[PDB]
């Protein structure tokens, strides 16, 4: 029932844009094609946790009519959603092409499409961030939430790039980060720190994953005072952290028809939380074979590696973050309660499609 | 001097950027020190037309304390610099996509020593954040906020739709599908001047000359005063001719002056040259061309030159100006009715752009 009409509202801002482009925009048929093509394919196909969250987190806290309200809250809160889903997409985009990925969600890559070209795909990138606010100025200027919920949206925008960088610069020694010189892959590693790793993914992550659904629903549904603002962050922070491990962690261990994807991180010789657990808990001996077979395609190379954080048991690490990431997460979530007891409950309804999340 | 405040509010615009990085995303010397670098080198070292133009339009119109002034003067340079950062930005990302090699005699972004395409991609995008960014710090209070941001990101979309013209152009549009590959375009029926004009009003008529001028405008809290049909017009009309010229140069201009080696050719560009060599060639001059275009063998690069050079690209092209150079004339009068301030900011917009050197 949610997904039905988050799947209208998408129709609905797809017409409103494809149709713009052919009125003002002197677009012709094929390149509507193209691009109605590309918002489907990168857009639609996912779980939509993001999305739905909004419209989730809006129907709860409505408690504060013929449903005229009821109807719009729930309808902007779809904008919202897909606000947040366009976001993705950009992202999902600009970062296959950057991480030189070969498919997700059992498809190409939208760059490894056979039609599009590596200059159109990072161009496709850029219109999926547009058509976020073109689809919000369309739905909301006459909201007075308007410039609180782009300001907002733009900020978490501005987060998840910096994480970006972040996370495509934590492979060389900053120190030794410099646009005029050369510099190859850290040989010594010391930068793949749990600390630095947690920065990574916070800014990355967390944000627009976790923060900015409960933001939006808040917003449109006009009860964003009503909650601990530095709660709700320090929960956002810590399922974003959570997520992004699994992410991680699935990356290794979950076989390609799972995952949609033959996962690389390693090859990619990634910052990845299974490097940085392993980096910390190794032997002199581990350390040095570690070092010796990281960041490289050849299959053996990269199944020892996979040796190696078996023989170090990363899984029952992982086991006992998770564990303790859930108690954590309980008790931020009672405190909410307290005072919020419909938000609570809608962040719970979020741990939920996170916590053990099969994806 | 009007470049003397705009380095000011350049260095404040920085000192917010980076520091407001270290203080709230937790970032570090090394990479703030990268950030700098790349923000210097992608947003200066230009000849700031729109930024600057900005400036310009509200001077000219703070007549219709003397310290509201200083206000409106400062709105302006922040404006000037969205919108040059909103080009920095373009051309990260446009450098990679048309895969060029320098700008500004620099090596590009991406192909700075130390800078990966994977980082360059993403750079690209700080640089878009920033305007949005900057712009919520200098301006939050401001009344005018909605309206400017509205119109700045409705010409961010029309400046990227121009860009999917221009790098969808060279293939014939009935068989775009994203999911069977098809090569250049061998018959070429689609470098029309029907579709050049397209592509060249959304990628950079817009925010290369109705943006500078819609912005000032909105700081001198004196847009509806201006016949915006008139305005849109004359910033059409400048902006096809500055990317005509752009064009010219690309295949003209030595590598020295111009600061880089052009692409136009190589990347079989739909530039005006080729679309109006096209319209008036031969057969035999078209398939000359046709077994030249899109390649980087550098003699079968001036052989496509000569094919330019001895078609008389150069009266077609004096031609061109001199009607261009009419029709702003007149729309320019239209304005200078009702409007004669901003007319005037207008006048000197053209003067910076009418057989530009540089
Ligand atoms: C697409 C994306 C946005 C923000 C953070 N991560 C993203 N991608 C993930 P992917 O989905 O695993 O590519 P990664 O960070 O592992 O490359
Ligand atoms: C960067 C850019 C933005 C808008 C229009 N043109 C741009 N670049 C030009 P360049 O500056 O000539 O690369 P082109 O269109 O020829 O690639
Ligand atoms: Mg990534
Ligand atoms: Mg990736
Ligand atoms: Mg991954
Ligand atoms: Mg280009
Ligand atoms: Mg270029
Ligand atoms: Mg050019």
């Given at each position: 029932?949610?997904?039905?009409?988050?799947?209208?509202?998408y129709?609905?801002?797809?017409?409103?844009?494809?149709?713009?482009?052919?009125?003002?925009?002197?677009?012709?048929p094929?390149?509507?094609?193209?691009?109605?093509?590309?918002?489907?394919?990168?857009?639609?196909?996912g779980?939509?946790?993001?999305?739905?969250?909004?419209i989730?987190?809006?129907?709860?806290?409505l408690?504060?009519?013929?449903?005229?309200?009821?109807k719009?809250?729930?309808?902007?809160?779809?904008?919202?959603?897909?606000?947040?889903?366009?976001?993705?997409?950009?992202?999902?985009?600009?970062?296959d092409?950057?991480?030189?990925?070969?498919?997700?969600?059992?498809?190409?890559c939208?760059?490894?499409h056979?039609?599009?070209?590596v200059?159109?795909?990072?161009?496709?990138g850029?219109?999926?961030?547009?058509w976020?606010?073109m689809?919000?100025?369309?739905?909301?200027?006459?909201?007075?939430?308007?410039?609180?919920?782009?300001?907002r949206?733009?900020?978490?925008?501005?987060?998840?790039?910096?994480?970006?960088?972040?996370?495509?610069?934590?492979?060389?020694?900053?120190?030794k980060?410099?646009?005029?010189?050369?510099?190859?892959?850290?040989?010594?590693?010391?930068?793949?720190?749990?600390?630095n790793?947690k920065?990574?993914?916070?800014?990355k992550?967390?944000?627009?994953?976790?923060?900015?659904?409960?933001?939006?629903?808040?917003?449109?549904?006009?009860?964003?005072?009503?909650?601990?603002?530095?709660?709700?962050?320090?929960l956002?922070?810590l399922?974003?952290?959570?997520?992004?491990?699994?992410?991680?962690?699935?990356?290794?261990?979950?076989?390609?028809?799972?995952?949609?994807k033959?996962?690389?991180?390693?090859?990619?010789?990634?910052?990845?939380?299974?490097?940085?657990?392993?980096?910390?808990?190794?032997?002199?001996?581990?350390?040095?074979?570690?070092?010796?077979?990281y960041?490289?395609?050849?299959?053996?190379?990269?199944?020892?590696?996979?040796?190696?954080?078996?023989?170090?048991?990363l899984?029952?690490?992982?086991?006992?973050?998770?564990?303790?990431?859930?108690?954590?997460?309980?008790?931020?979530?009672?405190?909410?309660?307290?005072?919020?007891?419909?938000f609570?409950?809608?962040?719970?309804?979020?741990?939920?499609?996170?916590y053990?999340?099969?994806?």
């Open positions: 029932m949610p997904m039905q009409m988050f799947m209208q509202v129709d609905e801002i797809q017409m409103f844009l494809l149709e713009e482009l052919e009125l003002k925009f002197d677009m012709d094929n390149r509507v094609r193209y691009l109605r093509k590309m918002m489907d394919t990168t857009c639609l196909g779980k939509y946790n993001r999305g739905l969250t909004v989730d987190v809006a129907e709860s806290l408690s504060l009519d013929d449903g005229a309200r009821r719009r809250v729930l309808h902007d809160a779809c904008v919202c959603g897909w606000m947040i889903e366009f976001l993705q997409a950009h992202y999902l985009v600009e970062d092409i950057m991480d030189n990925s070969v498919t997700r969600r059992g498809k190409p939208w760059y490894r056979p039609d599009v070209t200059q159109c795909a990072i161009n496709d850029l219109l999926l961030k547009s976020t606010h689809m919000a100025m369309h739905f909301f200027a006459d909201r007075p939430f308007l410039q609180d919920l782009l300001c949206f733009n900020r978490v925008d501005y987060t998840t790039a910096v994480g970006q960088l972040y996370d495509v610069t934590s492979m060389f020694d900053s120190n980060l410099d646009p005029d010189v050369s510099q190859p892959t850290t040989t010594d590693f010391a930068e793949f720190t749990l600390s790793y920065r990574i993914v916070k800014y992550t967390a944000y627009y994953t976790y923060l900015l659904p409960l933001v939006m629903g808040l917003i449109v549904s006009e009860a964003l005072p009503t909650v601990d603002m530095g709660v709700t962050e320090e956002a922070m399922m974003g952290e959570y997520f992004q491990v699994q992410d991680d962690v699935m990356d290794c261990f979950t076989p390609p028809e799972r995952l949609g033959v996962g690389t991180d390693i090859q990619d010789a990634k910052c990845s939380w299974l490097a940085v657990t392993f980096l910390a808990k190794a032997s002199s001996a581990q350390v040095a074979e570690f070092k010796a077979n960041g490289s395609g050849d299959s053996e190379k990269v199944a020892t590696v996979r040796r190696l954080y078996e023989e170090a048991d899984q029952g690490d992982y086991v006992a973050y998770e564990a303790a990431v859930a108690e954590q997460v309980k008790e931020l979530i009672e405190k909410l309660r307290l005072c919020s007891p419909g609570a409950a809608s962040v719970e309804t979020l741990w939920g499609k996170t053990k999340r099969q994806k």
